[PDB]
Amino acid sequence: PEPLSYAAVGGLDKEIESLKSAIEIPLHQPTLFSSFGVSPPRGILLHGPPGTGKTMLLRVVANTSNAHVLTINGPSIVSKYLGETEAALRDIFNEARKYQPSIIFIDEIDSIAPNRANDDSGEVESRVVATLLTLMDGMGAAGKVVVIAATNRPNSVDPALRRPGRFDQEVEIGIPDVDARFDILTKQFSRMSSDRHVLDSEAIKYIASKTHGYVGADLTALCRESVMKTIQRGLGTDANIDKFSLKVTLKDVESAMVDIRPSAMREIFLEMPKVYWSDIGGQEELKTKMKEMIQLPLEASETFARLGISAPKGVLLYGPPGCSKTLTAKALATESGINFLAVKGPEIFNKYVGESERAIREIFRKARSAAPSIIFFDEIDALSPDRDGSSTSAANHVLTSLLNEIDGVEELKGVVIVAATNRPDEIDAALLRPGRLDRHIYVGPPDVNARLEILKKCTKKFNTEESGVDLHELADRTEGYSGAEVVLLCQEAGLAAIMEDLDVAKVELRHFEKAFKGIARGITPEMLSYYEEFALRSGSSS
Amino acid sequence: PEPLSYAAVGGLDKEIESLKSAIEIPLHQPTLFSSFGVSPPRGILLHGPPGTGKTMLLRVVANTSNAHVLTINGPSIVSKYLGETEAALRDIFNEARKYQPSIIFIDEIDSIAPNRANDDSGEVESRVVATLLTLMDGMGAAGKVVVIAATNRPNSVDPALRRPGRFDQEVEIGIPDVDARFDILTKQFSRMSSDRHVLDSEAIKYIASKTHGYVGADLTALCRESVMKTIQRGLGTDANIDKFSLKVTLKDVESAMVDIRPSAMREIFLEMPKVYWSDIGGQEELKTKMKEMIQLPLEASETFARLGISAPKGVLLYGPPGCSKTLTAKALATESGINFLAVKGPEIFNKYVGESERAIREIFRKARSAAPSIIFFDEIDALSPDRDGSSTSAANHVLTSLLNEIDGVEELKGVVIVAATNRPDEIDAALLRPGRLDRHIYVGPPDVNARLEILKKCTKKFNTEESGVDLHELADRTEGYSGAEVVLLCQEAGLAAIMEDLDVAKVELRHFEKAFKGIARGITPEMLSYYEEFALRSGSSS
Ligand SMILES: [C][C][C]S(=O)(=O)N1N=[C]C2=C([C]=C([C])S2)[B@@]1([O])O[C]1[C]([O])[C]([C]OP([O])(=O)OP([O])(=O)OP([O])([O])=S)O[C]1N1[C]=NC2=C1N=[C]N=C2[N]
Ligand SMILES: [C][C][C]S(=O)(=O)N1N=[C]C2=C([C]=C([C])S2)[B@@]1([O])O[C]1[C]([O])[C]([C]OP([O])(=O)OP([O])(=O)OP([O])([O])=S)O[C]1N1[C]=NC2=C1N=[C]N=C2[N]
Ligand SMILES: Nc1ncnc2c1ncn2[C@@H]1O[C@H](COP(=O)(O)OP(=O)(O)OP(O)(O)=S)[C@@H](O)[C@H]1O
Ligand SMILES: Nc1ncnc2c1ncn2[C@@H]1O[C@H](COP(=O)(O)OP(=O)(O)OP(O)(O)=S)[C@@H](O)[C@H]1O
C-alpha cells in the first residue's frame, strides 16, 4: 500500500494547483471568506473526458489532505427504496459536519442526479436530486465542509445542481497535450526503475509525439501493454527464459501502440500536429500577411485601443485545393505561441441537432477562457445554409449560433477567428460582411520561387545536384500545379526510382519526366477565374 | 466425460496462444511483472461473431488450467431482487479471492451489464454494472485472480467495462478463413474414426473451400447433418438395414450443405475467393502496374523511408463495366500474400447512420492491426454525396469519416487503400485530391492480346483447334467488347452447342457466329469519351 502523492499525477499541474487552492481556502480557513462577506464556495466539480485522471485526483486529494474523507458510493449506499437512502445520505453529511474539517466525495454524479433527461425515475432520480439540492442549500458559511464532484460528462448533470451558490467551482481536467503526454510518460516510466526501462528521453519525446489521441489512463495501459509484449519477447526467444530484467524497448512500445488504441479523443476538437514556417515553401507575402493580421492584433491590444480601432475579428483564407492553407494555419499555430483551437467543417456540422449549437458554444467559451486564442475553422463550406429545406433545421441554426457568437465584440478581445475554404461562394454572405469574418486573404497557386522551395524541401533526401537534375527547369515546367501536385510530383518521381530498382539511391531526370507526364493539372482556368471573380465581390483585402 | 483439450479447438492457434499467454502471466506469475510496476492486466475479453467458439474456449481453458474456476451463470445466480444478487456475486468473488489462484468466468456480458442501451433497468442493469465496476476497481496486484468474459457482440457492452486499467485485454475470435475451416473440419472428422469418414484430405479441402460463410459451430452442425443424412441413405436402400459402419461420403456432405446453412454470417467484411494472375487474360501492363504500386510499397517500406517519400496511399481503378477490376484486385489479394480486407460499396453506405461510421472505423482498425494490409473499396460510387438532402444525413457523415480516417498518415504506414469505381465522376473530389486516394489507373476494354487470352482460357474445355475455329478471327472480330462480354460470348457459343445436340463435344464457328449476332456492345463511344474526360481531369497516372 503506497499512498499516492501529487508527484504521481502528471500533466495537470495547472489545475492541480487550482484544485489545491479551492480545497485549501475553505476546509482550512473559512474565516477569510467570512470577513469578505460572501458564502464560501462549497463544491468543486472535476469535469473531463473519461479516463483523464479524475478518480485518481480524488484519491490523491483524500490521501494528501489531512481532513476526513467521506464517500457517497453512488449505488453502493442507496438502498432498495429511497426512504432509507435519503436518510443514509443525510447521515453521511451529518457525520461529516460533526467531524469538521471534512470532504464529501461524489463520483459519477451522472449516476446520481441526471434528472434533466428522460431516465429520471421520479421514485429514484428525482428524489436524489431533490435531496442533493435540499441539503446543499445549507451547511453554514462557518462550516469546514467541502463537496468534491467528478463527472465523465457534465451536461448530463441537470442545470439545477450547476446553478451558482451550489457546487459550482469548476476544474476542467482535459485531454493532455504533447507536453502533458510527455509528463505522464516520464512519471509512468519512472515508476519502474530506469534500469528496466531502456528509453532515453528522446524516445519518450517520440512516443509522446505518436500518441496524439491517447488520454490519461490510456497511456498507462500503453505502458502496461509494453510490459506484456516485453515478456512475450522473452518467450519468443525460448520458453526456458524465466530470467527477469528483460528491458522494455521503444520497439516494444510501438508494438503495444498498434494494439491498445482504447477510447480517447477522436470526437474532440482537433489539436493539429507541429509544422514550422520553414516547412512551408516560400509564400513570404502570405506568411508576412498572416503573421501581421493574426499575431500582431493579439500582441498589440494596448496599441490598438490607444488608436481607437478595434482589432481585426476574423480572417478568411480562400484558395484552390492543394495550396497552402491548412498548412499555413498550422504553422501559425505552431510558432505564434497563441492558444489555437481548430475544428474541421463536417466534424461540427454533423453533431446531431443541439449538439452543433452546444459545440459552437463550448468552442467559443474555451477560446475566451484561454485568451489570447485563435479559433480555426477548416472548411466553413460545411456550415453552409445554401441547401434545401433540410438545411433550415441544421445549417440555419448553426449559422445563426456562429453569428451570435462572432458579433458582440465587447466580450471578444483576445479571440481571432480564422476560417479556411476552397468554395468561398457557398459561405453565407452574412458571415463575410464587415464587422465579422471580413479580411479575405487569397492563397492561390504558388509562384515559381515557392515551387522551387517546395522541391528543395521534398527532393532533399534523394540526391539532386549530383544526380544531374536541376530543380529550376522543373520549377518553371510545373507552372499551374498546386503545391499538393508538386509534392505528389516528387513522390511519383521517387516511385519511378523504386520502379527501376529496389535499392536505388539516385534519381534521374527521366523519372521526373515520367512523373510529370503522369500528373494532370488540378487547377483549371475556370477555377482561377472563379477565384478572382469572388475577389472582386469580396469585402476586405481583395 | 471426455476432457476437452486444445487439440479439440481448431483454426484459432494464434488466438489460442495469445489467450494462453494472457492467462499464464497473471494467475501463475503475478510477481514476475509486479516488479515492473504496472498493475497486472486482470480481466480479458473474448470477442467473436455468434458461434465462432467462445464458450468452448472458456470450457477448455477451465479444464486445462490448474486454478479453480468460478462461474457467474448470468441469471442463474441473480435472484428476484438485486439486494441478494450483488451480495451473491460479491460472495463469488470473495470465494475466488480466498482460494487463489482463481478464474472468474463471465459468459454473455451482454446478458449481464448492457447498460449503454435503453434496456437498462436501473433496478437491475445499472445495479449490476455498478457492482461490477465497484468490485472490478480492486482485486489486488498480488491477487492471483483473473476474469475471463465472453461476448457475442462487444459494442453492446458499455464503455465502462471497457475502460483501460480495467477489464481490458481483448482476444478477437473471428470468422474462420479457408485454412482455419480446413483445420476445423479435419479435427471434426478425425474425432470420428477414419473408417466411417471416407473423405481424403483433398475432399476436406474441397468442402472447406465451398463453405465460405460457415463459422465454427456451423461446421460441426454440418458434420452432424452429414451423419444424419448418411443414415438416411441407410434407410434409403431398405429399412431392414440396421448394420452400422455406414460410411459418410462427400456427396452426403454436400447434401447436408444444401440444408445446414443458418443466418450465421451477415453482410460481414467479405473474404474473396482465389484467382491467380494466370486467370486474368493478359492486361500485362495493368498486371505490372498494380503489382508495383501496391505490393512493392508494402514490402519496401525501409527503402521508401530512406528516400524521404511517403508510400503511395491510394489507387483508384476506373474502367468500363466488365473489364477486369474486381478480378484484378482479387488476384492481387490472392497471390500478393498481403492481408486483404475488402468490403463492397453498397453494403456499407446503406446500413445506417452510426452503423456506417462504426463500420469504417472498425475496418480501418482491423487494417492497422494486421499490417501490412490492403483495404479494397469496390464501387465507392455508392458512398457519394452528390444527391439530395437525404445525403446530408448519410453521405456526408460517411464520407467525412472516410476522409478523416485516410488522412491519418502518421499511423498509416502499413496500409494501402484500393478502390474500383465504374463511374468515377460521382466520387467526391475530396477523395481524389493529392495526399489521399490519388493514383488513378484506367483499366479499359481489353486489347486484342487480352481478348485472345480470355478466349483461350474459356474455350479450353471444348475443342477449338481441331474444331476448325481459329481464335484470332474471333479476337479481332470482337473489338470493343468488354471482358465480361467476351466470356459471355464463349458461354453463348456453348449454349448453341448444347442447342444443336444434347451430348455434343464439338463447337463450330457457326455457333460462335450465332452468339456474335446475339451480343450487343455495352461499351458505347460515349462511355469511352466519359472515361477519357475523367482522365484529363485526374490527379495522378492520367
Ligand atoms: C509530414 C509533413 C506534414 S505536411 O507537409 O503537411 N504533408 N504531410 C503528408 C503529405 C503531404 C503531401 C502529400 C501528397 S502526403 B504534406 O506535405 O501535405 C502538405 C499540405 O498538407 C498539403 C496541402 O494541404 P492544405 O494545407 O489543406 O492545402 P489545401 O488543399 O488548400 O487545404 P484544403 O483543406 O485541401 S481546401 O500540401 C503539402 N504541402 C507541403 N508544403 C507545401 C504544401 N502544399 C503547398 N505548399 C507548400 N509549400
Ligand atoms: C469461376 C470463375 C471466377 S470469375 O472469372 O471471376 N467469373 N465467375 C463467374 C462468371 C464470370 C463471368 C460470367 C459471364 S459468369 B467470371 O468469369 O467473371 C469474371 C469477372 O468477375 C468479370 C469481370 O468482373 P469485374 O472486374 O468486376 O468487372 P467490373 O464491372 O469492372 O467490376 P464491377 O464490380 O462491375 S465495378 O469478367 C470475368 N472475367 C474473367 N476473366 C476476365 C474477365 N473479365 C475481364 N477480363 C478478364 N480477363
Ligand atoms: N496524469 C495522469 N492522468 C491520468 N491518469 C493517470 C495519470 N497518472 C496516472 N494515471 C492512471 O490513469 C488511471 C486514471 O483512472 P481514473 O482516475 O478512474 O480515470 P477517470 O478520469 O476516473 O475516468 P472515469 O472515472 O471513468 S470519468 C489510473 O490507473 C491512474 O493510475
Ligand atoms: N475450432 C472450433 N471453432 C469453433 N467452434 C468449434 C470448434 N471446434 C468445435 N466447435 C464447436 O463449436 C460449438 C460452438 O460452441 P460455443 O463455444 O458455445 O459457440 P459460441 O461462441 O458460444 O457461440 P455464442 O457466442 O456463445 S451464441 C462447440 O459446441 C463445438 O462443438
Retrieve residue B233's grid coordinates: 441413405
- 8 A C-beta contact, residue B162 and residue B110: no
Placement of cell 499551374 in the chain? A480
CA A411 – CA A42 distance, rounded (Å) = 28
- CA B216 – ligand 4 centroid, Å: 6
Say how many C-beta atoms besides its own lie within 10 A of residue B30's C-beta.
Answer: 21
Query: Residues B319, A517, B541, CA angle at the centre, nearest 5°?
Result: 30
What pairs with residue A440 in β-bridges? A316
Give A-chain residues touching B436 at CB under 8 angstroms. Answer: none
B14, B36, B121, B412, best to mutate vs chain A, most A CBs in 10 Å: B36
Retrieve residue A246's grid coordinates: 528483460
Q: Computed from CA positions of residues A305, A309, A310, A315, in that sequence, does the dihedral angle turn out positive or negative?
A: negative
- Find the DSSP H helices in B262-352: 284-290, 296-299, 301-307, 326-334, 346-349
Q: Which atom of ligand 2 is nearest to the CA of B279?
A: 41
What is the b/e burial string over B39-61, where b = at least 16 CB atoms within 10 angstroms of the residue's CB?
bbbbbbbbbbbebbbbbbbbbbb
A488 touches chain B (CB under 8 A): yes
Q: Name which residue sits closest to atom 25 of ligand 3, judged by CA.
A: A55
What pairs with residue B171 in β-bridges? B46
Give the type of residue at A43: G
- Contacts of residue B84, defined as CB under 8 A and 6 or more positions apart, other chains included, come to none
- Nearest 5°: phi and psi at B390? -60, -30
Determine the 3-state secondary structure of B467 from DSSP. Answer: helix
Task: Work out the minimum CA distance from B111 to partner chain A, whole angstroms.
Answer: 20
Give A-chain residues touching B122 at CB under 8 angstroms. Answer: 119, 121, 124
Query: Residues B150, B153, B157, CA angle at the centre, nearest 5°?
Result: 80
B94 touches chain A (CB under 8 A): no
CA A471 – CA A458 distance, rounded (Å) = 11
Please give the distance of CA A241 from its chain centroid, rounded to a whole number: 44
CA B328 – CA A200 distance, rounded (Å) = 47
- 8 A C-beta contact, residue A507 and residue A498: no
CA B233 – CA B247 distance, rounded (Å) = 10
- Asked, as a colleague might, if the bond just before B320 is cis with ω within 30 of 0, I would say no
Retrieve residue A466's grid coordinates: 549530383
B307 touches chain A (CB under 8 A): yes
B305 touches chain A (CB under 8 A): no
Query: Residues A372, A378, A383, CA angle at the centre, nearest 5°?
Result: 110
- Contacts of residue B372, defined as CB under 8 A and 6 or more positions apart, other chains included, come to B298, B299, B338, B339, B414, B415, B416
Retrieve residue B223's grid coordinates: 458434420
B38, B304, B400, best to mutate vs chain A, most A CBs in 10 Å: B38
CA A296 – CA A299 distance, rounded (Å) = 5
Say how many C-beta atoms besides its own lie within 10 A of residue A315's C-beta.
Answer: 24
- 8 A C-beta contact, residue B176 and residue B3: no
Determine the 3-state secondary structure of B269 from DSSP. Answer: coil
Report CB contact under 8 Å: A461, B165.
Answer: no
Retrieve residue A349's grid coordinates: 456540422
Residue A121's closest chain B neighbor by CA?
Answer: B122
Q: Which DSSP state fits B137?
A: T
- Nearest 5°: phi and psi at B375? -80, 125
Q: How was this structure determined?
A: cryo-EM
- A415-421: strand order across its sheet: A339-344, A373-378, A415-421, A314-318, A439-442
- 8 A C-beta contact, residue A77 and residue A95: no
Placement of cell 469519416 in the chain? B401
B18 touches chain A (CB under 8 A): no
Cβ of A323 below 6 Å from ligand 1? yes
CA B513 – CA B474 distance, rounded (Å) = 9
Query: Closest Cα partner for A213 from A60, A1, A49?
Result: A49
Pairing of strands A44-46, A145-150: parallel
Residue B159's closest chain A neighbor by CA?
Answer: A263
Dihedral, B101, B102, B103, B109 alpha carbons, nearest 10: -140
- 8 A C-beta contact, residue B150 and residue B54: yes
Q: To which H or E segment does residue B417 belong?
A: strand B415-421
**Angle between the B391-406 and B353-369 helix axes, to the nearest 10 degrees?**
10
Q: What is the DSSP string of A467-485?
A: GT--HHHHHHH-TT--HHH
- Find the DSSP H helices in B420-536: 448-458, 471-477, 483-500, 509-517, 525-536
Task: Work out the minimum CA distance from B116 to partner chain A, whole angstroms.
Answer: 12
- Find the DSSP H helices in A157-307: 178-191, 201-209, 217-237, 250-260, 284-290, 296-298, 301-306
Residue A94, burial from CB neighbour count under 10 angstroms (0-12, 13-18, 19+):
exposed
> What's the farthest any 2 CA atoms get from each other in chain B?
88
Annotated binding residue at B50?
A: yes
Report CB contact under 8 Å: A495, B542.
Answer: no
Determine the 3-state secondary structure of A222 from DSSP. Answer: helix
Query: Closest Cα partner for B444 from B384, B534, B374?
Result: B534
Counting DSSP H helices and E strands in chain B, the numbers are: 21, 10
Task: Work out the minimum CA distance from B539 to partner chain A, whole angstroms.
Answer: 5
- 8 A C-beta contact, residue A38 and residue A97: no
Q: What is the DSSP string of A112-177?
A: T--TTSTT--TTTHHHHHHHHHHHHT-S-TT--EEEEEE-S-STTS-TTTTSTTSS-EEE------
Give the type of residue at A527: M
- Find the DSSP H helices in B311-352: 326-334, 346-349
Cβ of B268 below 6 Å from ligand 4? no
- Nearest 5°: phi and psi at B378? -70, 125
Query: Closest Cα partner for B255 from B280, B282, B231, B284?
Result: B231
- Nearest 5°: phi and psi at A197? -100, 85
Give the type of residue at B501: D
CA B229 – CA A252 distance, rounded (Å) = 53
Annotated binding residue at A289?
A: no
Say how many C-beta atoms besides its own lie within 10 A of residue A305's C-beta.
Answer: 12
What is the b/e burial string over A469-499, where b = at least 16 CB atoms within 10 angstroms of the residue's CB?
bebeebbeebeebbbbbbbbbbbbbbbbbbb
Retrieve residue B513's grid coordinates: 457466329
CA B120 – CA B112 distance, rounded (Å) = 10
Give the type of residue at A504: V
Say how many C-beta atoms besides its own lie within 10 A of residue A120's C-beta.
Answer: 17
A227, A248, A422, best to mutate vs chain B, most B CBs in 10 Å: A227
